[PDB]
Design an enzyme around this catalytic site. Structure first.
Site, PDB file in Angstrom:
ATOM      1  N   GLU A   1      -3.938 -10.797   0.331  1.00 46.60           N
ATOM      2  CA  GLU A   1      -4.553 -10.683   1.456  1.00 46.60           C
ATOM      3  C   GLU A   1      -6.073 -10.884   1.041  1.00 46.60           C
ATOM      4  O   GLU A   1      -6.724 -10.484   0.201  1.00 46.60           O
ATOM      5  CB  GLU A   1      -4.516  -9.019   2.140  1.00 46.60           C
ATOM      6  CG  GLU A   1      -3.069  -8.883   2.586  1.00 46.60           C
ATOM      7  CD  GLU A   1      -3.143  -7.406   3.132  1.00 46.60           C
ATOM      8  OE1 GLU A   1      -3.989  -6.951   3.584  1.00 46.60           O
ATOM      9  OE2 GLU A   1      -1.889  -6.836   2.937  1.00 46.60           O
TER      10      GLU A   1
ATOM     11  N   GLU B   1       0.844  -1.354  -0.038  1.00 40.60           N
ATOM     12  CA  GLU B   1      -0.028  -0.059  -0.073  1.00 40.60           C
ATOM     13  C   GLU B   1       0.973   1.402  -0.105  1.00 40.60           C
ATOM     14  O   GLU B   1       0.527   2.183   0.881  1.00 40.60           O
ATOM     15  CB  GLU B   1      -1.049  -0.247   1.278  1.00 40.60           C
ATOM     16  CG  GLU B   1      -1.836  -1.353   1.346  1.00 40.60           C
ATOM     17  CD  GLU B   1      -3.217  -1.028   1.413  1.00 40.60           C
ATOM     18  OE1 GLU B   1      -3.726  -0.325   0.539  1.00 40.60           O
ATOM     19  OE2 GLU B   1      -3.813  -1.547   2.325  1.00 40.60           O
TER      20      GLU B   1
HETATM   21  O1  LIG Z   1      -8.208  -2.402   5.864  1.00 41.58           O
HETATM   22  C1  LIG Z   1      -6.596  -2.188   5.687  1.00 41.58           C
HETATM   23  C2  LIG Z   1      -5.889  -3.509   4.997  1.00 41.58           C
HETATM   24  O2  LIG Z   1      -4.732  -2.889   4.358  1.00 41.58           O
HETATM   25  C3  LIG Z   1      -3.725  -3.778   4.217  1.00 41.58           C
HETATM   26  O3  LIG Z   1      -2.730  -3.297   3.206  1.00 41.58           O
HETATM   27  C4  LIG Z   1      -3.191  -3.995   5.746  1.00 41.58           C
HETATM   28  O4  LIG Z   1      -2.143  -4.799   5.669  1.00 41.58           O
HETATM   29  C5  LIG Z   1      -4.250  -4.449   6.793  1.00 41.58           C
HETATM   30  O5  LIG Z   1      -4.383  -3.503   7.781  1.00 41.58           O
HETATM   31  C6  LIG Z   1      -5.753  -4.528   5.996  1.00 41.58           C
HETATM   32  O6  LIG Z   1      -6.812  -4.576   7.116  1.00 41.58           O
END
Ligand SMILES: OC[C@H]1O[C@@H](O)[C@H](O)[C@@H](O)[C@H]1O
Ligand SMILES: OC[C@H]1O[C@@H](O)[C@H](O)[C@@H](O)[C@H]1O
Ligand code: NA
Ligand code: NA
Ligand code: NA
Ligand code: NA
Ligand code: NA
Ligand code: NA
Lengths: 989, 989
Positions: B496, B420
């Site tokens: 993720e 990010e």
């Molecule tokens: O909602 C934000 C999200 O962003 C990701 O990049 C981070 O690793 C996490 O915190 C996830 O929950």
């Protein structure tokens, strides 16, 4: 299989669509010579949680009372420990399924024993002036009937049931009933027998009802009199005597009195009269006045009037809906003392004895029927009782009892069908009934904007902009050409406006200018006269007001019930002080050269003869000149120029430039009135000679450097932060920029319109204005004069996770005893957050001093607070208050206490005195921080920390009325901008 | 005028755009025979709040230390009382104005004295494996340099500065620096020297760096080996010996080993090797494996693999970023024990010793560079360091150190540029550098969806729907045809997904089916492996986990840091138990007739030889049959049908209809492994013979009537409410309908898409589902059989101010010992609120019993919780747990503990036992109410009230993953509907 549930019969009656049963025909509240016995006093009371568990143990007989304890009557019984008050605004506290009631429904059994002498025989009745919400009445075990309409009167014939000697009156009262669905006013839910209970004998050949008709012909000066009298529903022979007017006439005939003095709120002339039959005589107060609508104007006695009104609820912080008479008389006097001339009985008939006081003291009254179905709006008005034919008889009965009880009082100039009850056939039936019964009073009702069934166009919280269009008759047309034609010919009234919740209301002046400019505008009634605070004790035993949620309510609306011009104990809020000035009936414009003043009589009927005009010149040392000036009486709606004594103008011309002086011209009561003593201030005007701009001190003192500190004259700076840690020995714990204040009640309301509807408070929290951080960019000294130097401290203020900020430069200079501080604010980046521009609450500084402040003095506007769109009541002058009195005791603590338009201020910190001077700035001093202020939900949460929080603002935004109605007007908004302002500081002794 | 501010020089260095200065070239972490001295232990520590007040008192010399106290190193110093932890997700805790730092910036001075023997001369270095965020290093008063890259290694040449005997190492560490702007990971801000500090001698003719290249030719079975060695940046002569492979080669030459056993996560074959020069030898573990991308598939050793991954942060509830080695080894074993085969080092390189463990135990690793600029997104990425040329050298250095340290480990199958960090030129430079330096590993980075500078297409939290389209290569095209062509040829990975916050995650199975169906889908990494709970003690001294806001943070993100599959102490959450089942590498489908089962080997390289296949038939009485069955090894990605012994099928055929029995077939480890003992369960399948529907009892008992109560068999009803007050002597305090549960973490997240984006919890509060009220409509008895009767109680459930409701009828029947309860739910009116349809959490009943429950037993799914879109790990069987173990210890208490798919349940209330039977229902038992559960922010807030709250649900909605990612899938939503369900009840002994 038969039913096995308990209490089905009681519940069925509570769910009844019909009015009370067994009651005598509705009539006027009349002062009669017939014997009467008030049963008010200590009754016996038992509370059950629901109808199904309410005992059926012959309690009505008064024998072997199990579980009854003493309770005063009248009373709101949650105010006396039985249950608790509950507050909702719009939402019903029970499931919406009319006419059904919830299982949790407090049932209050009331009982009293009394003695009835021979004068109450053979005929008598029992009168109940108010029972919330459903009562069942027994006398000596015999059921008399039931009551519906919580604020309406009921009478029951006890002939043949009342026994000579001892008697037992029993009353079962249910908090909730089908009637609850039509009594959804924004107020506390408070069951009980909360108004008088009276035994009245009805002698034969008496008088049951009376209808006074007292018109006024403004061209001829004649009074048009007809007094109707009836018995058993039939017109009867009766003699009417009005001694003062030298006339004796029969009841039922219209006569023409050659010359009467007309009744108005300005001149409430009342003629004492008596109508009598063989067995009974009634005493009346007759005010001759005629109400008419022509040329789209609401006219009384041939003249358009301006309504200067308030919405009056009936509330008492310890007795609930029971308002002691002395409190009523006191609060009405207080109204007159603040130039109020009109009252709306929001949203139900008042105590019956209220109307005589309104006749005598002088108010234009909007008497409102007990009807409100607001809680049905959220479902698109589905099942709205106002349009359900099953409720017609119940709603017509409410209107009938409303009209009949008060039809004789001159103060009532309008009937109102109710409040926020939507639209429906039943409202139209209520209108048809009233118009037929009493065509002498126009009908009011805001809930139907088409105005099909009313005589005036009413709205609530319409913006200043829309009010101007309506005042000019150019609002958009209704779809129905016929209805549009009718409404365009109506005058316009704001039955509610300038919501006075918390700090505020703002924008009052803009409304008032429209009221004066456009004849079609009748005026407005402020929401609200009083706060519904309920006195509560802390664990320590300290008193404070409670609001919604403070009584364990599952569903509530918080502090929305504390939204008044005075607190529950009738202490004025600053808003009332501004309101009085805004609606002042005379306008005084003092000439710049102090040679005279322009005087406009804004009254509708009276001239200026009742007023004494007084002038005073005040300077720093005190009064320099003053006296009285004679003014030939000015007619209503006329004006003149009044010359002032030459000494005043001569004094002005001789003032050395830069010396402050204030000329105040006041109009006061020349003689005592029924509502105030001679000398009471009614209107005022001022002309100010402003003190010159403050001269910055010469930068002759240099900067003395040390490892950890810098010294410049009396200022010691922290070399690590660049901020002062001491000024003239006064410890300075913190100094920084401010852009935020503890949100007011208005700041917590949604800013309707536009893509952003977050409350301003939420916009502020999201933007981080409440949590600003400062980064030191640099510190440097620069050449001053004659060996001295200035000290410039460059900083940048922002907030965590934000890219926008402001560069703030403090340039310090001193000559040894006077400190000069120049602040320069420059925006860095665009102040936008979540796609919407951020707005500021202020542009100022916060001085956190390490010592307490006992006294605050200043020259500017006072004595009370003033914000850009408020403070009309704050006049120019010199003021001094102990610190505690600088604060405003709002029930929910919030931003308040700023004194805008200040030129100089003096804080007494023990033995020393801190003097602040500069171009106009707002002044605020508190013993607690803004975070403590914002976090505090009640006043006990505020606690002094031994410091002094001094706020010096170069700019402030308005307060508006966003809690309900228009927000801050454009001209009072505060958008991010660059700014530079200068101050001088000085510590003494 | 010169500057007068303090500490400008230190601040200027903290605001530097460049990497650390004075450090040796980045290299690999290598196991060397060179002497080494770990300086870990008790250091001396002094904390100052900012650079301007950080003393300059010659402390580095270690003499006359003023204000230094003992502190362990490595350490996160807020974990040891110095300051406090602070948690933010996306938002920076400081104003965003790079590279500037706030004035509040904790400065930690570290110091240690150590002894250096003759073996550390003439050449040695000091190695710092991690300093958050900016360190300055002195040795004997001589400045060695600075460190940037908080999770990256730094080495400083101490030759000529290190003195024989005593030495003094001093390190000044600033929490915040310019680097803070590129280290915005969603985790705790924790400054300190949190990784090893090592003294290492550098003998002449040694080895500084080594680059292992170990490929694998899957067609020939050959290994392709080249071991590069360098010194002072120059390729050197060195001998490489790999004893097991019988080869000795020179460093720098590529050789072809005829036959090697390839490395994979399933089979982590490692060959021990040593590369040595005259003065130094390095020990290596070589895993031969080749990574390739073809046909839009991520392939290892010629085969597409499926990633069964988790995102691994480094956290410890008491030591912060310091993870003890035994905890690392334990948690990795726990990962393997739950079928995990992949790890993403979110979002920074791990401890250097982590990678050897990943090589040995077997994980496909995504090693991620320490880079995240998430906090810049809210400003449209303005000033994003990733696109600011001034940050290029700093970001390239971060990537270089990342690659160099870990380039030798077979477990690393991908380099990741960061997380990010938006898009920008610097990310492209980081990609170009990595591709040139190490073309053997594909590059990963999700922040640039165009995938211009990467080799795999990565996304986070893409819906199941979009994942299916991508898996089929039919997602919408990129605007740039060339970039689109490149991305369509890439495999797809979810770096993720299935956010595991609180109760959940739901919808895992839908993702997994897509992973198996579409070769382009590489799999996914769950967010997150662990919760970042920090142990906190109550006033009473009871332990519980704290999260954001629990440490006085001005700005924080609450419990978003506790979003893991295990708690901070590595205790599994239910989500991990479901995850293990979802990703099981074998699929076992047991035949309905119990004659056999279908076995699919989902592994990529290994066959089934390592597993033992075992079967067991269990009934109410216990195990009836069981054993082992021989399975000829099934190749990876192949399947077979395995016949079960005839006794099993024969047993099934002989079961009397309606008798419950469960056949479970399990695949367990035949022998001990490096990560679990023999018998460890890897996969399983079941076939259930369901117990017949429960027979309602005959309505032979009648209804006995009394004034205040009704009795029907063992049930005593309250005649006022119609609800039971006693069943078999067990007091029943309350019984009513339920439509609501204490919102989960997912319920508190916004439901993106559509006009309504209120969180489901807010939709529920607005609709009043948490505050339902019930009105009794009637009670009646009806003819049963043979003189008995049923009891029907008609009610209506709704909420205050709402018109919608549900009619609920309870029909009771009993034969004397068994109670039958039929519930019928019918909607009354449209369930819409604020213009949006209301959804329900459940359709069930709440029994509030007046006695405590010690034990809960049931037949259904267990042992752990299960909701419609979860519970994959809950298998059919008979379960029994003490009440406390029915609960789930989420850090923020929320809805949990329901056991879906229950057919029968038994609550042990002291001496009595309450048995509930019926068609499938969800079971929940708690010692506290739902309101207590919802109000509780931490576990100590839950307190038993001496009652039992039993929930029997006919329907439940899913839990989804709305806290971050998709909400509840369509098929799991619960919209208002009519329903009817039957239960039987019985109390015993
Ligand atoms: O909602 C934000 C999200 O962003 C990701 O990049 C981070 O690793 C996490 O915190 C996830 O929950
Ligand atoms: O905002 C609701 C408004 O509605 C009015 O009818 C009511 O009398 C007040 O409570 C006012 O505040
Ligand atoms: Na009731
Ligand atoms: Na208020
Ligand atoms: Na209100
Ligand atoms: Na600093
Ligand atoms: Na959680
Ligand atoms: Na998180």
């Amino acid at each position: 299989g038969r039913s096995l549930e308990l209490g089905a019969a009681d519940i069925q009656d509570l769910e009844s669509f019909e009015a009370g049963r067994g009651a005598l025909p509705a009539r006027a509240y009349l002062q009669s010579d017939a014997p009467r016995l008030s049963l008010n006093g200590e009754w016996q009371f038992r509370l059950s949680p629901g109808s199904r568990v309410a005992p059926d143990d012959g309690w009505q007989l008064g024998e072997a009372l199990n579980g009854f304890e003493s309770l005063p009557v009248p009373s709101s019984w949650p105010m006396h420990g039985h249950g608790a008050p509950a507050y909702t605004n719009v939402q019903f506290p029970f499931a919406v399924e009319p006419p059904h009631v919830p299982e949790a429904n407090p049932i209050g059994d009331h009982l009293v024993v009394f003695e009835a002498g021979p004068e109450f025989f053979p005929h008598a009745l029992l009168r109940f002036d108010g029972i919330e919400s459903a009562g069942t009445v027994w006398l000596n075990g015999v059921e008399l009937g039931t009551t519906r309409g919580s604020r309406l009167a009921h009478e029951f014939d006890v002939s043949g049931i009342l026994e000579q000697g001892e008697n037992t009156l029993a009353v079962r009262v249910a908090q909730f009933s089908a009637a609850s669905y039509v009594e959804d006013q924004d107020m506390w839910w408070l069951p009980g027998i909360f108004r008088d209970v009276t035994l009245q004998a009805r002698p034969a050949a008496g008088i049951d009802d009376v209808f006074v008709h007292a018109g006024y012909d403004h061209i001829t000066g004649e009074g048009i009199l007809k007094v109707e009298a009836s018995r058993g529903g039939q017109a009867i022979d009766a003699v009417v005597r009005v001694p003062e007017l030298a006339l004796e006439l029969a009841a039922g005939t219209e006569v023409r009195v050659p010359a009467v003095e007309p009744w108005s709120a300005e001149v409430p002339k009342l003629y004492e009269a008596a109508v009598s039959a063989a067995g009974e005589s009634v005493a009346l107060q007759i005010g001759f006045r005629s109400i008419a609508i022509e040329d789209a104007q609401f006219k009384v006695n041939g003249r358009r009037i301006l309504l200067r009104g308030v919405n009056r609820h009936e509330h008492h912080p310890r007795l609930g809906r029971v308002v002691p008479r002395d409190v009523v008389e006191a609060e009405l006097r207080l109204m007159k003392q603040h130039n109020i001339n009109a009252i709306r009985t929001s949203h139900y008939p008042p105590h019956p004895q209220f109307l005589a006081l309104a006749d005598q003291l002088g108010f234009y009254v909007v008497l409102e029927c007990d009807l409100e179905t607001h809680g049905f709006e959220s479902a698109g008005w589905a099942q709205n009782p106002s349009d359900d034919p099953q409720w017609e008889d119940a709603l017509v009965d409410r209107m009938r009892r409303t009209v009949e009880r008060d039809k004789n009082h001159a103060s009532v100039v309008m009937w109102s069908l109710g409040n926020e009850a939507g639209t429906g056939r039943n409202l139209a039936a209520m209108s048809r009934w009233t118009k037929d019964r009493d065509p002498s009073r126009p009908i009011h009702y805001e809930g139907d904007w088409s105005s099909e069934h009313v005589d005036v166009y009413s709205r609530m919280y319409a913006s200043q902009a829309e009010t101007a269009l309506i005042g000019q008759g150019i609002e958009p047309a209704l779809n129905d050409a016929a209805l549009d034609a009718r409404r365009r010919a109506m005058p316009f009234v704001l039955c509610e406006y300038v919501h006075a919740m918390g700090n505020g209301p703002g924008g009052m002046s803009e409304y008032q200018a429209l009221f004066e400019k456009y004849p079609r505008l009748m005026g407005g009634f402020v929401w609200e006269w009083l706060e519904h605070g309920i006195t509560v004790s802390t664990a320590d035993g300290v008193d404070h007001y409670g609001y919604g949620g403070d009584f364990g309510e599952e569903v509530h609306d918080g502090n929305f019930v504390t939204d008044g011009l005075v607190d529950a104990d009738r202490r004025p809020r600053p808003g009332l002080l501004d309101f009085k000035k805004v609606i002042e009936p005379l306008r005084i414009d003092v000439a710049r050269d102090w040679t005279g003043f322009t005087l406009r009589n804004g009254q509708d009927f009276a001239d200026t003869s009742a007023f004494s005009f007084r002038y005073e010149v005040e300077a720093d040392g005190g009064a320099l000149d003053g006296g009285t000036v004679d003014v030939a009486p000015v007619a209503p709606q006329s004006e003149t120029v009044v010359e002032l004594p030459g000494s005043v103008a001569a004094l002005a011309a001789g003032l050395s430039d830069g010396r402050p002086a204030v000329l105040t011209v006041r109009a006061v009561l020349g003689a005592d009135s029924a509502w105030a003593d001679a000398g009471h201030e009614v209107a005022w005007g001022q002309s100010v000679r402003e003190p010159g701009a403050p001269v910055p001190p010469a930068p002759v003192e240099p900067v003395q450097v040390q490892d950890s500190e810098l010294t410049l004259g009396p200022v010691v700076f922290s070399r690590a932060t660049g901020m002062p840690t001491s000024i003239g020995g006064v410890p300075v714990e913190k100094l920084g920029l401010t852009l935020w204040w503890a949100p007011t009640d208005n700041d917590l309301g949604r800013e309707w319109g536009g893509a952003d509807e977050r409350p301003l408070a939420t916009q502020w929290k999201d933007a981080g204005l409440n949590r600003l951080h400062t980064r030191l960019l640099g510190i440097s000294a620069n050449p001053g004069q004659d060996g001295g130097e200035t000290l410039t401290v460059r900083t940048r203020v922002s907030a965590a996770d934000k890219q926008y900020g402001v560069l703030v430069d403090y340039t310090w200079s001193t000559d040894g005893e006077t400190v000069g501080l120049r602040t320069q604010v420059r925006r860095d980046g665009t102040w936008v957050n979540r796609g919407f521009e951020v707005e500021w609450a202020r542009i100022g500084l916060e001085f956190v001093l390490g010592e307490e402040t006992e006294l605050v003095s200043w020259f500017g506007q006072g004595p009370h607070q003033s914000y850009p769109d408020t403070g009309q009541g704050a006049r120019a002058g010199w003021f001094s208050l102990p610190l505690a009195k600088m604060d405003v005791e709002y029930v929910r603590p919030q931003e308040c206490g700023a004194r805008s338009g200040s030129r100089s201020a003096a804080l007494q910190l023990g033995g020393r005195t801190l003097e602040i001077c500069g171009d106009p700035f707002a002044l605020t001093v508190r013993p607690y921080s803004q975070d403590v202020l914002d976090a505090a939900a009640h006043r006990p949460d505020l606690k002094a920390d031994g410091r002094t929080y001094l706020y010096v603002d170069h700019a402030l935004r308005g307060v508006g009325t966003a809690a309900c109605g228009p927000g801050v007007l454009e001209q009072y908004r505060l958008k991010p901008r660059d700014a530079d302002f200068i101050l001088t500081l000085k510590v003494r002794s």
